[PDB]
Design a binder for this molecule. Structure first.
Ligand SMILES: CC(C)CCC[C@@H](C)[C@H]1CC[C@H]2[C@@H]3CC=C4C[C@@H](O)CC[C@]4(C)[C@H]3CC[C@]12C
Ligand SMILES: CC(C)CCC[C@@H](C)[C@H]1CC[C@H]2[C@@H]3CC=C4C[C@@H](O)CC[C@]4(C)[C@H]3CC[C@]12C
Ligand SMILES: CC(C)CCC[C@@H](C)[C@H]1CC[C@H]2[C@@H]3CC=C4C[C@@H](O)CC[C@]4(C)[C@H]3CC[C@]12C
Ligand SMILES: CCCCCCCC/C=C/CCCCCCCC(=O)OCC(O)CO
Ligand SMILES: CCCCCCCC/C=C\CCCCCCCC(=O)OCC(O)CO
Ligand SMILES: CCCCCCCC/C=C\CCCCCCCC(=O)OC[C@H](O)CO
Ligand SMILES: CCCCCCCC/C=C\CCCCCCCC(=O)OC[C@H](O)CO
Ligand SMILES: CCCCCCCC/C=C\CCCCCCCC(=O)OC[C@H](O)CO
Ligand SMILES: CCCCCCCC/C=C\CCCCCCCC(=O)OC[C@H](O)CO
Ligand SMILES: CCCCCCCC/C=C\CCCCCCCC(=O)OC[C@H](O)CO
Ligand SMILES: CCCCCCCC/C=C\CCCCCCCC(=O)OC[C@H](O)CO
Ligand SMILES: CCCCCCCC/C=C\CCCCCCCC(=O)OC[C@H](O)CO
Ligand SMILES: CCCCCCCC/C=C\CCCCCCCC(=O)OC[C@H](O)CO
Ligand SMILES: Cc1cc(-c2nnc(N)nc2-c2ccc(F)cc2)cc(Cl)n1
Ligand SMILES: CCCCCCCC/C=C\CCCCCCCC(=O)O
Ligand SMILES: CCCCCCCC/C=C\CCCCCCCC(=O)O
Ligand SMILES: CCCCCCCC/C=C\CCCCCCCC(=O)O
Ligand SMILES: CCCCCCCC/C=C\CCCCCCCC(=O)O
Ligand SMILES: CCCCCCCC/C=C\CCCCCCCC(=O)O
Ligand SMILES: CCCCCCCC/C=C\CCCCCCCC(=O)O
Ligand SMILES: CCCCCCCC/C=C\CCCCCCCC(=O)O
Ligand SMILES: CCCCCCCC/C=C\CCCCCCCC(=O)O
Ligand SMILES: CCCCCCCC/C=C\CCCCCCCC(=O)O
Ligand SMILES: CCCCCCCC/C=C\CCCCCCCC(=O)O
Ligand code: NA
Length: 388
C-alpha cells in the first residue's frame, strides 16, 4: 500500500489546475457580457449564471473536494455541507441549461412575441428562483435525509475523531438512495431528457420553417410558368389566386414591405385583367412579377434563410454545452447506480472515483472555449479584453 499522500498529491494538483482554469475562463465570460452590449440579452444572462456556478466550482467546490479526500474529522452536519455544496452548483447549472434551451425554443417558435414575453427583468427573477431551488435541492440532505444518525464509529475512532465527529467522506454521510433516486433520476436525468425534447422541437421547428420558405418560393416560380403557358383567362386566374395567397403567407421592414406591396399589387393588376377575359394582357402583366421577384422577393428569401441558419447554429452551440455537461457528470452518476443497485459488485476503485470527480470538474473549464470557437461576438470580445 503506497503512501496515500502520493496519490493524493496527483489528484490535488490536478484539481487545483482545474480550479485556476475554471475561474479564469468563466470570469472572462462574465467580463465579456458586462462590457459588450451586443452580448447583453436574456440568453447570455443564463450563460452568466452558468459561468457563476463554474466560478464557484473553482473557488469553493474544488477546495471542498480536496478537503473531503483527506477524510478529516468533522461534525457530521459540517461534513454534510461541504459534501453537498457541489450538488447546489450542479443543480444550478442544470436549471440554467434548461432555461437556455427554452429561450431558444421561444425565439424560433414564436419570434414575433419573443421580446414581449422574454425580458431581462423576468430572466433575472427566474435566475434568482432557480438558485434558491438549487440550494433547496442540493442541501436536502441537511434537512434530515442523511446518515448522521448512524455514524461509522469504528472509522471515527481509528482516526481519533472527537465526540459527535465522523470521518468526513461523501458516501458515509450522503445517502445513496438520495443520490440515485432523488438527485440523479429526478433532478438530473429528467431535466436533461426534457432538454433533449426541447432541442428536438427546436431543430424540427427550424427544418419546417426552412421548408415553408422553399415551398413558397417554389409556388411562386411554378405558378409563373403556368400563367405563361395558359390558354384561357380562367387558368391565369387560378394560378394568380394561389400566388396572392402565397405572397401574403410569405409576407407574414420598409424595403421589405414595399417589395411585397409591389408584388401583391402586380398580382391584383393581372387578376383584374384575367377576370375581364383579357388573357394576353394578363400574361404580360404577370411577366412583370419576375422583375419584382429578382429585385425584392429573392433577397427576402435569402435573408430569411440566413437568419434561420444562424438560429440553428446558435441552438447547436447551446446543445453542445448541454451535451458536454451530461458527458462530464454521467460517469459519477453511473458509478453511484452500480454502488447502489449492485451490492454484490465490488465498489468502483478509488482511482476511478478520483477520475470521475476530475472529469465532472473539467466541465467548468470547457464552456468558455465553446463560446470562443462557436460565437463570433464572444471571441472578438475575448480578444479585446486580453489584448488591452
Ligand atoms: C462567503 C464564503 C467565502 C464563505 C465560505 C465559508 C465556508 C468555507 C465554511 C462555512 C461553513 C464551514 C463548515 C462548518 C462546519 C464544519 C464542521 C467542523 O467540524 C469542521 C469544518 C466545517 C466542515 C466547516 C468548513 C468550512 C465551511 C464550509
Ligand atoms: C458517459 C459515458 C462516458 C459512459 C460512461 C461509462 C462508465 C462510467 C462505466 C462503463 C463501465 C463501468 C464499470 C464496469 C464495471 C464495474 C465493476 C463494478 O464492480 C464496479 C463498477 C464498475 C467499475 C463500472 C463503473 C462505471 C463504468 C466505468
Ligand atoms: C442518460 C442515459 C445514458 C440514461 C442513463 C442510463 C443509466 C440509468 C443506466 C445505464 C447502465 C445501467 C446499469 C447497468 C448495469 C447494472 C448492473 C446491475 O447489477 C444493477 C443495475 C446497473 C447498475 C444499471 C443501473 C442503471 C444504469 C446506470
Ligand atoms: C440574481 C442573483 C441570484 C442570487 C440569489 C441567490 C440566493 C441563494 C440563497 C439561498 C438561501 C436559501 C437556501 C435554502 C435551502 C435550505 C437548506 C439549509 O440551508 O440548511 C443548512 C442548515 O442550517 C442545516 O444546519
Ligand atoms: C476570494 C474568494 C473567497 C474565498 C472562499 C473561501 C475558500 C475556502 C477554502 C477552503 C475550504 C476548506 C475548509 C475546510 C478545512 C477543514 C479542515 C479542518 O477543519 O480540520 C480541523 C479538524 O477538526 C479535523 O481534525
Ligand atoms: C459568495 C458568492 C457570491 C456571489 C459571487 C459568485 C460568483 C461571481 C459571479 C457573478 C457574476 C455577475 C456578472 C454580471 C454580468 O456579467 O452581467 C452584466 C449584465 O447582465 C448587465 O446586463
Ligand atoms: C450576486 C452577483 C450579482 C451581480 C450582478 C450585477 C449585475 O448583473 O448588473 C445588473 C445591471 O447592471 C442591470 O442594471
Ligand atoms: C458559503 C457558501 C457560498 C455560496 C455562494 C452563493 C452564490 C449564489 C448565487 C450566485 C448567483 C450569481 C448569479 C449571476 C447572475 C446575474 C445575471 O445573470 O444577470 C441577469 C441580468 O442582470 C438581467 O438584468
Ligand atoms: C480567501 C480566504 C482563504 C483562507 C482559507 C484558505 C484555506 C483553508 C485552509 C484549511 C486549513 C487547514 C487546517 C486544518 C488543520 O490545521 O488540522 C490540523 C489538526 O486537525 C490537528 O488536529
Ligand atoms: C452555517 C452552516 C453550518 C453547517 C452545519 C454545522 C452544524 C455542525 O457543525 O454540527 C452538527 C453535528 O453533526 C454535531 O455532530
Ligand atoms: C422552496 C425552497 C425554499 C427553501 C427554504 C427552506 C426552508 C427551510 C429549511 C429548514 C431550515 C433548517 C434545516 C436544517 C435544520 C437542522 O438542524 O437539521 C437537522 C436534521 O434532521 C438533519 O439531520
Ligand atoms: C427518467 C427517469 C428514470 C427513472 C426510472 C426509475 C425506475 C426505478 C425502479 C427501481 O429503482 O427498482 C426498484 C429496486 O428494487 C431497486 O432496488
Ligand atoms: C431510464 C433510467 C432508469 C433505469 C433503471 C435502473 C434500474 C436498476 C435496477 O432496478 O436494479 C434492480 C436490482 O439490481 C435488484 O438487484
Ligand atoms: C466533493 C465531491 C464528491 C463527489 C462524489 N463522491 N462520491 C460519490 N459516491 N458520489 C459523488 C457525486 C456524484 C454525482 C454528483 F452530481 C455529485 C457528487 C463528486 C464531486 Cl464532483 N465532488
Ligand atoms: C493549497 C495546496 C494544497 C493543500 C492541500 C492539503 C493536503 C491535505 C493532505 C492530504 C492527505 O492527508 O493525504
Ligand atoms: C481529466 C484529465 C486528468 C487526468 C489525470 C488524472 C487525475 C486524477 C486521477 C487520480 C490519480 C490516481 C488516484 C490515486 C492513486 C491511486 O489510488 O492509485
Ligand atoms: C500544485 C501546487 C502543489 C500541490 C502539492 C500537493 C501536496 C499537498 C498534500 O498532499 O499534502
Ligand atoms: C480556460 C482558460 C481561459 C483563460 C484565458 C485567459 C483569460 C484571463 C484574463 C482574465 O482573467 O480576464
Ligand atoms: C471570483 C468572483 C469574481 C467575478 C468576476 C465577474 C466580473 C464581471 C463583472 C463584474 C462587474 C464589473 C466590475 C467593475 C466594473 C468597472 C467598469 O465597468 O469600468
Ligand atoms: C480565490 C480564493 C480561493 C480559496 C483558496 C483555497 C485553496 C485551498 C485548497 C484546499 C484546502 C484543503 C484543506 C485540507 C484539509 C485538512 C487536511 C486534514 O485535516 O487532515
Ligand atoms: C487565499 C489563497 C489561499 C492561501 C493559502 C493556501 C494554503 C492552504 C494551506 C492548507 C493547509 C493544510 C494542512 O495544514 O493540513
Ligand atoms: C421559490 C423561491 C422564491 C424566491 C423569491 C425570489 C424573488 C423573485 C421574484 C421575481 C419573479 C419574476 O420576475 O419572474
Ligand atoms: C426541494 C423542493 C422545492 C420545493 C418547491 C416549492 C416552493 C417553490 C414554489 C414555487 C416557486 C415559484 C416562484 C414564483 C414567484 C412569484 C413571482 C411573481 O410574483 O410574479
Ligand atoms: C482509462 C479511463 C477508464 C476507462 C474505463 C473504466 C474501467 C475501469 C474498471 C475498474 C476495474 C473494475 C474493478 O476491479 O472493480
Ligand atoms: Na457547471
Amino acid at each position: 500500500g503506497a503512501p496515500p499522500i502520493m496519490g493524493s498529491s496527483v489528484y490535488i494538483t490536478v484539481e487545483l489546475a482545474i480550479a485556476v482554469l475554471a475561474i479564469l475562463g468563466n470570469v472572462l465570460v462574465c467580463w465579456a457580457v458586462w462590457l459588450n452590449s451586443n452580448l447583453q440579452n436574456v440568453t447570455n444572462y443564463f450563460v452568466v449564471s452558468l459561468a457563476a456556478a463554474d466560478i464557484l466550482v473553482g473557488v469553493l467546490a474544488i477546495p471542498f473536494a480536496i478537503t473531503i479526500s483527506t477524510g478529516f474529522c468533522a461534525a457530521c452536519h459540517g461534513c454534510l455541507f461541504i459534501a453537498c455544496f457541489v450538488l447546489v452548483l450542479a443543480q444550478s447549472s442544470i436549471f440554467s441549461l434548461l432555461a437556455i434551451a427554452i429561450d431558444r425554443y421561444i425565439a424560433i417558435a414564436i419570434p414575433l412575441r419573443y421580446n414581449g414575453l422574454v425580458t431581462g427583468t423576468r430572466a433575472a427573477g427566474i435566475i434568482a428562483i432557480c438558485w434558491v431551488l438549487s440550494f433547496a435541492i442540493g442541501l436536502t440532505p441537511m434537512l434530515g435525509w442523511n446518515n448522521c444518525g448512524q455514524p461509522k464509529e469504528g472509522k471515527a475512532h481509528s482516526q481519533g475523531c472527537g465526540e459527535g465527529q465522523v470521518a468526513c467522506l461523501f458516501e458515509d454521510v450522503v445517502p445513496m438512495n438520495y443520490m440515485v433516486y432523488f438527485n440523479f433520476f429526478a433532478c438530473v436525468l429528467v431535466p436533461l431528457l426534457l432538454m433533449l425534447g426541447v432541442y428536438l422541437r427546436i431543430f424540427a421547428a427550424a427544418r419546417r420553417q426552412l421548408a415553408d420558405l422553399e415551398d413558397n418560393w417554389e409556388t411562386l416560380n411554378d405558378n409563373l410558368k403556368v400563367i405563361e403557358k395558359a390558354d384561357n383567362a380562367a387558368q391565369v386566374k387560378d394560378a394568380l389566386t394561389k400566388m396572392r395567397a402565397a405572397a401574403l403567407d410569405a409576407q407574414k421592414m420598409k424595403d421589405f414591405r414595399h417589395g411585397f406591396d409591389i408584388l401583391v399589387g402586380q398580382i391584383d393588376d393581372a387578376l383584374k385583367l384575367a377576370n375581364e377575359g383579357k388573357v394576353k394582357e394578363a400574361q404580360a402583366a404577370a411577366e412583370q412579377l419576375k422583375t419584382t421577384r429578382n429585385a425584392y422577393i429573392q433577397k427576402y428569401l435569402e435573408r430569411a434563410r440566413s437568419t434561420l441558419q444562424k438560429e440553428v447554429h446558435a441552438a447547436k452551440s447551446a446543445a453542445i454545452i448541454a451535451g458536454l455537461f451530461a458527458l462530464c457528470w454521467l460517469p459519477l452518476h453511473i458509478i453511484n447506480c452500480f454502488t447502489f443497485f449492485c451490492p454484490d459488485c465490488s465498489h468502483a476503485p478509488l482511482w476511478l472515483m478520483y477520475l470521475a470527480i476530475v472529469l465532472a470538474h473539467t466541465n467548468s473549464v470547457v464552456n468558455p472555449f465553446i463560446y470562443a470557437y462557436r460565437i463570433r461576438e464572444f471571441r472578438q470580445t475575448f480578444r479585446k479584453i486580453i489584448r488591452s
